[PDB]
């Protein structure tokens, strides 16, 4: 229950998102990426509309996750994906989380150690 007057804008198609409590519309944002509280990288990440509470989800490829230490053979079905496919992280990787801290422009990822590179 929010109202923003659309005459203040104009791509005002993003207005309903804000009126429904969302912080950030889909787009490509410069973010600091963290995985299990370890700093990974600072780069542009594309955020598409998705099933998250935030209304948006980051597009992370198999290769980009492997570049963060993910042992991709340990993740069932991951090998079936295409190279450019946005990994459905929170459903494919058991117990994994992704959240964008919008105020800090910081993408916080978590992935259980069972799936990371160890021993």
């Amino acid at each position: 229950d929010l109202y923003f007057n659309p005459r203040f804008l104009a791509a005002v198609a993003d207005l309903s998102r804000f009126e429904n409590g969302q912080e950030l519309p889909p787009g490509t944002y410069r973010v600091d990426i963290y995985l299990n509280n370890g700093y990974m990288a600072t780069r542009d990440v594309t955020f598409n509309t998705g099933d998250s509470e935030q209304g948006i989800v980051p597009c992370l490829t198999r290769a980009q996750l492997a570049s963060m230490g993910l042992n991709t053979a340990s993740v069932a079905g991951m090998n079936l994906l295409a190279d450019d496919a946005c990994v459905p992280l929170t459903t494919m990787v058991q117990d994994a989380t992704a959240h964008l801290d919008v105020g800090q422009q910081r993408l916080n990822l978590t992935i259980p150690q069972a799936f990371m590179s160890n021993r």
Partner: protein, 211 residues
């Protein structure tokens, strides 16, 4: 309501980004925040990328804007370049007010963005001293030989308070001089941290080899 974290931004040449805080102090309000850069003439210039360029913030909150240098090293590297950071705060409105004839306002806060090359020998806080003055029958010209934009304030000719002036690096600006303006000139400046530098005595422009 919304405030910004600083009244000017100094962008160091070579830095991948600079940042600027945006704050809201009211728990019971949501603002849309829309941000962009203009060149010196107040025209949009995308060569500084502001991100995220559109977002909502709810309640007592601080959000950080990223300012990215996308000028491809095309600006001068011996003097500052002036840009303007723009942050527009757009309030929500109570739905009850939809049944009322309403004027609603949004507010754009505008602050200087100075692109500052590397390796300037003159310390920023030594610049104000370098200013020089040229006087005509009805105007006063401020002469800035430094590589910094100087924001000159509390400018006085005798007891007569003059207009503030923004004096471009290695350049000049002119203000009006009332006919009753006294002789001794004094001035201050606004520094990198948005504070006043000390009151100084104006020194006049001089001829070669001369007092």
């Amino acid at each position: 309501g919304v405030a910004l974290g600083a009244t000017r931004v100094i962008y160091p040449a070579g830095q991948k980004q600079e940042q600027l805080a945006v704050t809201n102090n009211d728990e019971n309000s949501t603002y849309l925040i829309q941000s962009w850069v203009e060149n010196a003439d107040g025209v949009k210039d995308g060569r500084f990328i502001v991100t995220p360029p559109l977002f909502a913030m709810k309640g007592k909150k601080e959000n950080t804007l990223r300012i990215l240098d996308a000028t491809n090293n095309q600006l001068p590297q011996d003097r500052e370049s002036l840009f303007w950071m723009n942050v527009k705060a757009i309030p929500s409105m109570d739905k009850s007010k939809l049944t009322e004839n309403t004027l609603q306002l949004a507010i754009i806060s505008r602050i200087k963005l100075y692109y500052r090359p590397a390796k300037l020998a003159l310390p920023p806080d030594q610049a104000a001293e370098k200013l020089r003055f040229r006087r005509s029958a009805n105007s006063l010209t401020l002469i800035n030989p430094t590589p910094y934009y100087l924001t000159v304030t509390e400018l006085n000719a005798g007891t007569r308070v003059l207009e503030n002036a923004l004096v471009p690096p290695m350049g000049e600006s002119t203000v009006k001089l009332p006919s009753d303006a006294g002789s001794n000139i004094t001035y201050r400046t606004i520094n990198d941290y948005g504070a006043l530098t000390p009151k100084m005595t104006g020194v006049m422009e001089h001829h070669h080899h001369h007092h």
